[PDB]
């Protein structure tokens, strides 16, 4: 696929540009909640508003973020960092 975008992982599974070979979850059905995730996923290049990993091709998230599994307990948005 793309040259990267394996979840801007500051510490979770694999990150938005250093693996691309593990599992990724997809974006909810509700547009906004989606943009909310946009946040947890990274942002304007995490420094400059270049455009890389543009969340158009379909940005998905990596494993080790939710607790237990299937989203529950309290964590809804994959931000664990
Ligand atoms: Zn991740």
Swiss-Prot record:
Tissue and organ expression note: Expressed in skin fibroblasts.
Disease: Methylmalonic aciduria and homocystinuria type cblL: An autosomal recessive disorder of cobalamin metabolism clinically characterized by early-onset seizures, and profound global developmental delay with severe intellectual disability. Metabolic features are mild methylmalonic aciduria, low-normal plasma methionine, and high-normal plasma homocysteine.
Homology family: Belongs to the THAP11 family.
Cystine crosslinks: none
Protein name: THAP domain-containing protein 11
Zinc finger (THAP-type): 3-81
Function as written in the Swiss-Prot or TrEMBL entry: Transcription factor, which has both transcriptional activation and repression activities. Also modulates chromatin accessibility. In complex with HCFC1 and ZNF143, regulates the expression of several genes, including AP2S1, ESCO2, OPHN1, RBL1, UBXN8 and ZNF32. May regulate the expression of genes that encode both cytoplasmic and mitochondrial ribosomal proteins. Required for normal mitochondrial development and function. Regulates mitochondrial gene expression, including that of components of the electron transport chain.
Locations listed in the record: Nucleus; Cytoplasm
Quaternary structure annotation from Swiss-Prot or TrEMBL: Forms homodimers. Interacts via HBM with HCFC1. Forms a complex with HCFC1 and ZNF143.
Top-level division of the source organism's lineage: Eukaryota
